[PDB]
Amino acid sequence: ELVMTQSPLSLPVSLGDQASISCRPSQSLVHSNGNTYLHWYLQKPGQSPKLLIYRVSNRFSGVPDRFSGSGSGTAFTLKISRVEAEDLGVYFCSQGTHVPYTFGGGTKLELKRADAAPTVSIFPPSSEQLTSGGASVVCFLNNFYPKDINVKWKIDGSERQNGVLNSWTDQDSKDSTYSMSSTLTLTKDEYERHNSYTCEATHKTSTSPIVKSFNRNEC
């Protein structure tokens, strides 16, 4: 083994700029043969990723001029100078001087945007779900930016439940915002065992975390 810390996890870059995205292994990658073995790959949504620069510096076949690859020690960089649409995705840096072949975390390249406060909407449970002895609650945190966003369900405040399914979204085409669902899942009864729940979302746009509530009671 030997770690590969892709120094930066999300590159929010508007088109037409440089793209440093560093990758540091754990040990020497210099085999006792002489050549080191850091290597780059780009993974396009839906497809088996692919070979960028191989053997650290060396550029591949059918592969743009706009990619720089250079390093030494515990420091290796990949630099795309004129990023342009077809280059958007993730970039696994790799290692191959030591068994086994560790793959880095994968930094990504997403469209740049300026912040955009998330819109939350809680919807209560439907009587037919109610009817199967089940009961869900879902608070949608729609069309917003940047990604990082946690959402705690202080059902009636104290208890921090954790029977949660989080569904994200690959960035928006004509918006470049994201949107999410959160489905705290209850035992029908569990549900009919409380009066009002609250969905709490904390996303650095607000000081005071956007909270929405739902009254099982007066309704």
Binding site: T102, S126, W168
Partner: protein
């Protein structure tokens, strides 16, 4: 010029094992390491293990020795991965690969999903704001889908009337069953003046549903 094609994605019951193959067109077999990698959503890439065809030589990640087997039929130019004693954590996409001082060319992708499940249709629960909360601009709505199998879910949530922001959230894989929503942005005036309705369409069973909300 060279190609690596893989068999098509499967659905396997636990215990039972699969045979993924990796046919290579465009060169001599017996010289390049036939690599295989694990792509699990979340984990990333787990190099599984090497093997060069011809010599019959092998190489495994300690982790995988005993779970995987690699064979190659030189006169058929196929590669092999047998994952015996299957399970919930093997459910992922697997790639074969030609790689040397690099991971030269990558196969397309075989998906392998482990699940106990037997085909079943989406129990459709309609998310509609209840007693007097949400007020103003867009009345947002939704249609949740609680449990079913397999991925064949498609929602025609064509608006209720005057609306567009339609979000289709991904599918979680929990307890071997599937559960995802849909969500819409309809402005006050237009609702309930006319009615919005979803249609959950699960062709894996030729069963479909239409449900008006409120």
């Amino acid at each position: 010029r060279v190609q690596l094609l893989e068999s098509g994605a499967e659905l396997m019951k636990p215990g039972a094992s699969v045979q993924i193959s990796c046919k290579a067109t465009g060169y001599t077999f017996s010289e390049y390491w036939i690599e295989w990698v694990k792509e699990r959503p979340g984990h990333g890439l787990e190099w599984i293990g090497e093997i060069l065809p011809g010599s019959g030589r092998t190489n495994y990640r300690e982790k995988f020795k005993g779970k995987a087997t690699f064979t190659a039929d030189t006169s058929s130019n196929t590669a092999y991965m047998q994952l015996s004693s299957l399970t919930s954590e093997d459910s992922a996409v697997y790639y074969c690969t030609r790689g040397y001082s690099s991971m030269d060319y990558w196969g397309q992708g075989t998906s392998v999903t482990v699940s106990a499940a037997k085909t079943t249709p989406p129990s459709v629960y309609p998310l509609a704001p209840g007693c007097g909360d949400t007020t103003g601009s867009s009345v947002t709505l939704g249609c949740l889908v609680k449990g079913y199998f397999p991925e064949s879910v498609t929602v025609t949530w064509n608006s209720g009337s005057l609306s567009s922001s339609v979000h289709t959230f991904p599918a979680l894989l929990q307890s071997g069953l599937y559960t995802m929503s849909s969500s819409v942005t309809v402005p006050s005036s237009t609702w309930p003046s006319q009615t919005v309705t979803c249609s959950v369409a699960h062709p894996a069973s030729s069963t479909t549903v239409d449900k008006k909300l409120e």
